[PDB]
Amino acid sequence: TVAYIAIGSNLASPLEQVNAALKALGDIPESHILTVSSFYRTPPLGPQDQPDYLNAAVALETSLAPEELLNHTQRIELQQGRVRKAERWGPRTLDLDIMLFGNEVINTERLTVPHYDMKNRGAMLWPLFEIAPELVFPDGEMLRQILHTRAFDKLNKW
Numbered sequence: 001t002v003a004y005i006a007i008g009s010n011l012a013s014p015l016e017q018v019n020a021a022l023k024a025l026g027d028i029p030e031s032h033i034l035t036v037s038s039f040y041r042t043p044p045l046g047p048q049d050q051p052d053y054l055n056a057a058v059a060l061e062t063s064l065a066p067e068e069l070l071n072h073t074q075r076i077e078l079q080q081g082r083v084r085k086a087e088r089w090g091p092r093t094l095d096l097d098i099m100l101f102g103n104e105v106i107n108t109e110r111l112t113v114p115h116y117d118m119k120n121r122g123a124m125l126w127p128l129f130e131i132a133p134e135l136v137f138p139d140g141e142m143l144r145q146i147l148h149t150r151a152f153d154k155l156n157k158w
């Protein structure tokens, strides 16, 4: 099954950690990386005197079950990133989100796929479109039509 994973890092110095995260993704059992998007830059959310986010998408071929893949992405987040000191609930320094898992729809305590908000996020959709321009969502919606209808602004490259 092809899973699509979003990577995000809002570290002041992210490119390095992102590359380490990619290595970790490629080390996941019963899996291999098919494609990695370009690295994109998105502005901080809120105060503009904070670091930009580096965003990318990864296509990962895997025979793991969806919750098994989650085990690994969670492990990698714990190993390669951390929560923020004075805000233990905000974005971690490294985010790995399972955006899509084949054509599967999943709604469990641990896992919701497709990612609940991805259709509203250029940071997810644009890198995804670079690596899977012909993608169709489980509900039948075309990635190309979402980007066109919703008239998203493109992201700058990192």
Ligand SMILES: [Cl-]
Binding pocket: 114, 137, 138, 139, 140
């Ligand atoms: Cl969907």
